[PDB]
Write a protein that binds this ligand. Structure first.
Ligand code: NA
Length: 130
């Protein structure tokens, strides 16, 4: 499923992402935008290390979910990576929450540092009623 901007903003809000571990809703929107373009079935293989990024938040199989084919990987979210490709983002959100519980926080995603950090991210939620 490819979410519309405001549809996603309202969904993330009801799933309790606004201010989760000090991360504003607009930051989560900026992250999803740059990671997958609001696409829940997005996948990206990293040939250099044999891992794959899954879902709307593009979480890596080496640490967050299990896909079986990634060498020396852990499954911190305790999920099959298939769970992160559903139209319903409940599991993807629960796993994104686990990621930011680590010291790095939102900084764990390099894309956030590149396109979201220290920028005016208001535009991602403006007019959505959240
Ligand atoms: Na894994």
């Amino acid at each position: 499923k490819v979410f519309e901007r405001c549809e996603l903003a309202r969904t993330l809000k009801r799933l309790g992402m606004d201010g989760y571990r000090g991360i504003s809703l607009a930051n989560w929107m900026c992250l999803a935008k740059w990671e997958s373009g609001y696409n829940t079935r997005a996948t990206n293989y990293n040939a250099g290390d044999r891992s794959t990024d899954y879902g709307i938040f593009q979480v890596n199989s080496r640490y967050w979910c299990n896909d079986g084919k990634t060498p020396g990987a852990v499954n911190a979210c305790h999920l099959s990576c298939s769970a992160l490709l559903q139209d319903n983002i409940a599991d993807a959100v629960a796993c994104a929450k686990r990621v930011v519980r680590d010291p790095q926080g939102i900084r764990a995603w390099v894309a956030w540092r590149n396109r979201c950090q220290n920028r005016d991210v208001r535009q991602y939620v403006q007019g959505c009623g959240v």
